[PDB]
Design a protein around this ligand. Structure first.
Ligand SMILES: [Cl-]
Length: 568
């Protein structure tokens, strides 16, 4: 996939490597196979291999781990592709013991993704079934390539686990994934971090490299720097409504493993959602994904002319060959013209204007300490709980928590309107720093905002000059910190760093335009990603970013992962 290779970083090396380990493991379970999938893995895996590849290695069937009895199927092998979690082990046992004895015996194998755990195998041994697996194995799929500059773990629970449950299991896998990167792309000489989770990943990287027993890595470093950042250092950014094209698509429809599902009417029973893939392989999408949504119209018009001219030339040799490209480019323009229309419908409603006014009030310091009328109206009209929670948390973070009278008012109305089950929800938002009572000390956020210029009025959305174009005024704190690390360095902002959570550090790993790998521990938004691509294309900025994350998220999916499964 050509799009996985952007400038100096060729992420096919990683993808081709995991695609090879997969083949090799499938060959090891020789004879026909059915894979039983932990549901959560199916989507992410799609980015590594499709069914076409698995068929090549005699995978004749695929089921979802449901439990009870496995469907019959004349295969020699059954292979569980499961995450190392205990709940699932119990379900796996049901399957092994629910074996129909009125058929031929099917051999059982298990593939832990990304790797086994001690606790799990104890569950299987205690349940009896441990001894029934021929091959127990692991498939070290940690960082998944989503695009040429983008990798994700797609580990949804990671934020909740680290910040609420005292569980740093995801950080270990992150460190592991960084080792895999280093083995293919060279050791990363310089490590910088800000955050508690970032300190831990650093420590683990350094220890693991200490503990390495292979032949010597003789690869010239692709990445000059690693920057590890705790999501909880910037809790504001995900709460805000993203205003880039890709961000809006994600906010409204959601993008899952690089695909989106859209109302099908404008495109070409029941009629299934129009399913589209969204990454940089589609030229037009590369040109618009990162733009403020108000800039997209103009690119669309320009594309129309470029297409007409291509046909006008073909009207008056090489054009037989470009024609399959030309047709596809019209189709692409037609697809994104329709999406833009779907999005413009959302973004020109009165409710959207009002929400955005409030968000921008909070982000720029206005009335962050009083009960907000619009939020009250949304509650009274029983708008989506998540939208309400996003706003009350946005308020709380811009204010460093709320006074008692105001926090209590919001909790009582939320509980009364959406139900008392949401007392778990509010407890979690407080433990996570999102919606809390203030201390009655000074609110530090204004100092940070001013000093790092996080809010600016009347920003240019058509030809941006600053990272704030992605939220039409708010410069993501996270990206701003990346920017200032690169120039003029974090010593010039020591006072601000000290009033942000956890330590800031640097470490050096010894070796026999800079590229910086930036790793968001606890999630990253598409808007933040757009802003980092903006930094990478400034001629002056002297740093290009490759973005890594535990999870691609938005404020809606972020807060949902802090709610108790299942929903109402
Ligand atoms: Cl929206």
């Amino acid at each position: 996939a050509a799009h996985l290779s952007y400038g100096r970083v060729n992420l096919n090396v990683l993808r081709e490597a995991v695609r090879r380990e997969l083949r090799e493991f499938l060959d090891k379970c020789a004879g026909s196979k059915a894979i039983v999938w932990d549901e959560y893995l199916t989507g992410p895996f799609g980015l590594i291999a499709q069914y076409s590849l698995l068929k090549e290695h005699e995978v004749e069937k695929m089921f979802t781990l449901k439990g009870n009895r496995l469907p019959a199927a004349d295969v020699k092998n059954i292979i569980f592709f499961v995450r190392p979690r205990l709940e699932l082990m119990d379900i796996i046992a049901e399957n092994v013991l629910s074996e129909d004895r009125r058929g031929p015996t099917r051999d059982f194998h298990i593939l832990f993704v990304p790797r086994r755990s001690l606790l799990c195998e104890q569950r299987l041994k205690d349940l009896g079934v441990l001894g029934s697996f021929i091959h127990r194995e692991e498939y070290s799929l940690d960082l998944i390539p989503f695009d040429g500059d983008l990798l994700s773990m797609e580990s949804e629970g990671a934020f909740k686990e680290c910040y609420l449950e005292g569980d740093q299991t995801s950080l270990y896998h992150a460190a592991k994934g960084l080792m895999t990167l280093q083995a293919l792309y060279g050791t990363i000489p310089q490590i910088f971090g800000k955050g508690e989770c970032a300190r831990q990943v650093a420590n683990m990287m350094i220890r693991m490299k200490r503990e390495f027993t292979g032949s010597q890595n003789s690869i010239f470093p692709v990445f000059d720097n690693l920057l590890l950042l705790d999501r909880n250092v910037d809790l504001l950014t995900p709460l805000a409504t993203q205003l880039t094209y890709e961000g809006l698509i994600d906010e409204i429809y959601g993008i899952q493993n690089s695909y989106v599902k859209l109302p099908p009417e404008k495109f070409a029973l029941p009629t299934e959602a129009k399913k589209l893939q969204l990454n940089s392989a589609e030229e037009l999408y590369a040109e618009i994904r990162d733009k403020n949504f108000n800039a997209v119209g103009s690119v669309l018009s320009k594309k129309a002319k470029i297409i007409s001219a291509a046909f006008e030339e073909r009207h008056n040799k090489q054009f037989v060959s470009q024609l399959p490209h030309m047709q596809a480019a019209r189709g692409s323009l037609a697809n994104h013209t329709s999406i833009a229309e779907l999005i413009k419908d959302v973004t020109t409603s009165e409710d959207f204007f009002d929400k955005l006014t409030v968000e921008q009030e909070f982000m720029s310091g206005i009335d962050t300490d009083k009960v907000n009328n619009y939020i009250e109206d949304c509650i009274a009209q029983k708008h989506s709980l998540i939208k309400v929670l996003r706003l009350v948390c946005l308020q709380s973070v811009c204010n460093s928590g709320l006074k008692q009278k105001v926090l209590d008012y919001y909790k009582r109305e939320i509980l009364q309107t959406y139900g008392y089950e949401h007392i778990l929800t509010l407890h979690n938002l407080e433990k996570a720093g999102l919606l809390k009572p203030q201390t009655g000390g000074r609110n530090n956020y204004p100092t940070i905002r001013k000093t790092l210029r996080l809010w600016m009025d009347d920003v240019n959305e058509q030809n941006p000059t600053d990272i704030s174009y992605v939220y039409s005024g708010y410069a993501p704190l996270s990206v701003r910190l990346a920017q200032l690390l690169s120039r003029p360095g974090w010593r010039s902002i020591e006072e601000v760093l000290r009033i942000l959570p956890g330590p800031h550090f640097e470490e050096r790993q010894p070796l026999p335009n800079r590229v910086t790998l930036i790793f968001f521990l606890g999630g990253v938004t598409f808007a933040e990603i757009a802003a980092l691509r903006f930094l990478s294309q400034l001629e002056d900025g002297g740093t290009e970013y490759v973005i890594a994350t535990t999870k691609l998220m938005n404020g809606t999916s972020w807060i949902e992962a802090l709610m108790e499964k299942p929903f109402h």
